[PDB]
Amino acid sequence: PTHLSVDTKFKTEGLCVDIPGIPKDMTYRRLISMMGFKMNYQVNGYPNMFITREEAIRHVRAWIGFDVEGCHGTNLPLQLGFSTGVNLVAVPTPLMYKGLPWNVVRIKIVQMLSDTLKNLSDRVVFVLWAHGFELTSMKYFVKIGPERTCCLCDRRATCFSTASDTYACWHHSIGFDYVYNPFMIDVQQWGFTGNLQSNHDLYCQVHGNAHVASCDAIMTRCLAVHECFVKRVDWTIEYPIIGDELKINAACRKVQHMVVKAALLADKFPVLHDIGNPKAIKCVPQADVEWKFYDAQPCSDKAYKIEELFYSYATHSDKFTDGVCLFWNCNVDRYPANSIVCRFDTRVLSNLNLPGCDGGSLYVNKHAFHTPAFDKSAFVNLKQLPFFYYSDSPCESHGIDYVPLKSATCITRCNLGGAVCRHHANEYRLYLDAYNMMISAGFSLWVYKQFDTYNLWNTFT
Ligand SMILES: CN1CCN(C(=O)Nc2ccccc2)CC1
Ligand SMILES: [Zn+2]
Ligand SMILES: [Zn+2]
Ligand SMILES: [Zn+2]
Question: What controls its activity?
Fold first, then answer.
């Protein structure tokens, strides 16, 4: 139970308009053979070109929706569409390119996949809504064989060059012409009634249908993401480290402690309502406040209605208007005015944030989290939280070459007294780096309108 058996049955109804007369009884073994590929019984890490839903979810960073539309089947040109928005036209002789032979088209496919995937994944997973032409066109740009390594590094081989007879990963494939050992999954195999557009539109209004192959490719990957990350969630799946995951997560913990500690000192709320992660611990353990936790799992479809988070059935709910409410990555439609909020901005461009369903995004950092679309109106009762650094720690060095720190946002006893000490200057610079790391990763901070750092200076007396 690791790979998809080649002898698994493949439902062929979706393929019969492009391939009339196709047998209803069909295996992956026979389908692959029909596509022009010879597996010759090989136990070398590539048992099937097709993979299970579970293997696809483990490799979501590799997903590339692919669709082929028969413009005019050997004698006709084909429109090759990708979920990157690219449309290529291959002639047998929203970025739309004119008709070119396969020998040049395949060089473009390798360039595009390599640039899109080199910082995301060790492979490609073609996400299909298979009708026939996409499967039969694969032989014109795909080569298969045993698992291999790059000619220039230790990464697995994803590309092949006929000019040099060598193999490369996504980082070293410049000038390569063939996709090597790609994987693929047919979304139609999951049991769907009706066509791609009708199933996609049930959950998403952001992707339209301009009737080009890239629109179908985008809709296909969108629908796959809804099925695997929106309606079905698995937070037990671990994903590899591809970027600043560790620094971002450490920054988030530093920022949360800083902001919450400062809010409690400036406004002295008697009670804090910590709403979100059922596994959460107190971010400011030494604070005076009555800390009360409320469980809400990360919402992956629509943002929580604030009224449902306070809904208590036949009993009285806790008083949310007393003290402060802390929503650390707990996505609601409209935050109460007495809130401290961290909300991920789904629009952020990064290697951790993949395009999602209905304006939302799939943020992949250790775990995959489909996040609802960022909506500025959720924050109408609050203001953006400005950067500040606060510290009550003693002015002592212990144990880097100096330029004295001058900043109005270094809230320390030394700055109050006229001159920032070396320890607080080092800590301020580290904290500003962590803050910038967290912000550039996509997180946004919001706070109740009465929040004022001027109230922190009198904590030094
Ligand atoms: C039966 N329970 C009663 C308690 N309950 C709430 O009090 N929710 C809540 C959440 C955050 C702040 C204040 C109240 C949910 C339903
Ligand atoms: Zn390489
Ligand atoms: Zn969509
Ligand atoms: Zn100091």
Answer: Inhibited by Remdesivir antiviral drug (GS-5734).
